[PDB]
Amino acid sequence: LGRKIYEFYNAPIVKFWFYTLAYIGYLMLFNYIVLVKMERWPSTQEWIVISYIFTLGIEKMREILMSEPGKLLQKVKVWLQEYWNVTDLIAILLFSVGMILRLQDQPFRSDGRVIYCVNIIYWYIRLLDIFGVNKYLGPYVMMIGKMMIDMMYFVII
Amino acid sequence: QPFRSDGRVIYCVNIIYWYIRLLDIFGVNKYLGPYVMMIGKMMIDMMYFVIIMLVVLMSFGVARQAILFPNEEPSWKLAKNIFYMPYWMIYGETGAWIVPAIMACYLLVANILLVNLLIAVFNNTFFEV
Amino acid sequence: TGAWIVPAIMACYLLVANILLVNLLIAVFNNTFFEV
Amino acid sequence: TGAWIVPAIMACYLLVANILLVNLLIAVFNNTFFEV
Ligand SMILES: Cc1cc(NC(=O)[C@H](c2ccccc2)N2CCCc3ccccc32)no1
Numbered sequence: 001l002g003r004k005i006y007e008f009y010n011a012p013i014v015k016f017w018f019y020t021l022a023y024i025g026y027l028m029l030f031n032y033i034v035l036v037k038m039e040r041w042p043s044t045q046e047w048i049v050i051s052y053i054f055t056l057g058i059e060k061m062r063e064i065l066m067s068e069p070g071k072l073l074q075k076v077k078v079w080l081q082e083y084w085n086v087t088d089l090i091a092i093l094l095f096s097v098g099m100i101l102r103l104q105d106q107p108f109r110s111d112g113r114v115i116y117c118v119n120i121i122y123w124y125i126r127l128l129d130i131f132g133v134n135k136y137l138g139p140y141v142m143m144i145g146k147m148m149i150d151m152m153y154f155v156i157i
Numbered sequence: 158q159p160f161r162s163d164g165r166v167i168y169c170v171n172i173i174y175w176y177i178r179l180l181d182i183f184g185v186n187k188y189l190g191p192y193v194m195m196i197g198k199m200m201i202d203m204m205y206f207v208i209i210m211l212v213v214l215m216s217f218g219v220a221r222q223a224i225l226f227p228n229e230e231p232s233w234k235l236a237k238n239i240f241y242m243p244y245w246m247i248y249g250e251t252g253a254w255i256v257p258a259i260m261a262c263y264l265l266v267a268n269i270l271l272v273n274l275l276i277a278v279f280n281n282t283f284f285e286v
Numbered sequence: 287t288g289a290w291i292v293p294a295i296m297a298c299y300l301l302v303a304n305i306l307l308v309n310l311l312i313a314v315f316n317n318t319f320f321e322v
Numbered sequence: 323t324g325a326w327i328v329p330a331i332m333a334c335y336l337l338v339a340n341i342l343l344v345n346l347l348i349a350v351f352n353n354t355f356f357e358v
Pocket residue numbers: 019020022023026052053056059130
């Protein structure tokens with residue numbers, strides 16, 4: 001039975017729905033805390049939001065360290081070869097400057113909350129990468145990419 | 158009353174059903190054979206677009222609700238503003254005002270993105286049928 | 287109960303209704319302009 | 323002279339302008355959805 005629970009959780013199909021219930025949970029709790037009032041210290045629901053990113057950050061660092069190249073300068077460029085992966089880290093960095101500003105008093109506290117509002121507009125278009133697992137969202141998300149090179153690209157004329 | 162008004166309300170969801178019940182009776186004719194059947198396959202496209210539609214339309218419904226109105230109590234009425242108020246800002250409006258300018262223009266390329274996507278699913282699909 | 291939820295459901299079903307009618311009216315002509 | 327004719331010309335040229343922009347934005351995607 002211990003082998004059954006071990007082999008069930010280690011499957012990549014099982015790990016998909018096991019983390020995307022946590023991802024849609026991070027989306028809805030972050031929607032909750034922006035609606036809840038701000039104070040000098042974060043509440044219980046805000047404290048689980050911040051720790052969700054900090055545990056994600058160590059997870060991103062093990063992607064660099066446990067990578068295929070061996071040389072340290074080599075395992076920087078190949079990790080930034082993905083268009084989704086490069087814009088992931090700037091949103092984590094925007095969350096971090098948003099945390100320091102929110103921990104300080106007003107008017108810095110309203111400024112840090114504003115940087116949270118450009119975080120939540122990012123995490124929905126982050127999900128599009130997770131969308132392409134299905135038979136219809138494979139093509140549908142990919143044509144958002146080519147319409148992206150048509151919709152800020154119409155705008156010249 | 159008030160049970161009598163409740164029973165009349167369930168009559169109102171009956172009459173919305175009996176018109177889409179007629180669609181089965183429609184397919185007897187030479188044109189409503191294909192026309193009703195493609196309502197069936199567009200049914201698996203129009204509550205099936207909406208996974209990525211709520212990604213783009215509701216995200217602005219919670220982003221606007223934090224820049225504007227930042228002192229809201231935790232309640233269910235805030236959740237009522239995430240699908241109804243974005244459908245009702247057709248006439249609505251450091252750099253404190255630049256942040257509404259960026260999200261409004263990104264909404265301009267968002268509702269054009271959603272309209273262009275909803276007229277994308279059907280273009281190929283009407284041709285082999 | 288949800289007295290205001292019933293207008294919310296019929297308004298959103300109207301949102302997918304007038305988009306349904308507009309998409310259907312631009313559906314009849316797309317094939318028909320091509321063989322002509 | 324025609325002081326009000328100049329707003330009339332630019333308003334009607336705007337009528338064929340926002341129809342020009344809408345028709346152009348539904349032009350880029352029509353071919354592109356078909357080979358994909
Ligand atoms: C907070 C927060 C966000 C988050 N989700 C991700 O950012 C993302 C992901 C998205 C959906 C389902 C599962 C994971 N994710 C985080 C873990 C490292 C990683 C590696 C490759 C692809 C995605 C990914 N989890 O917690």
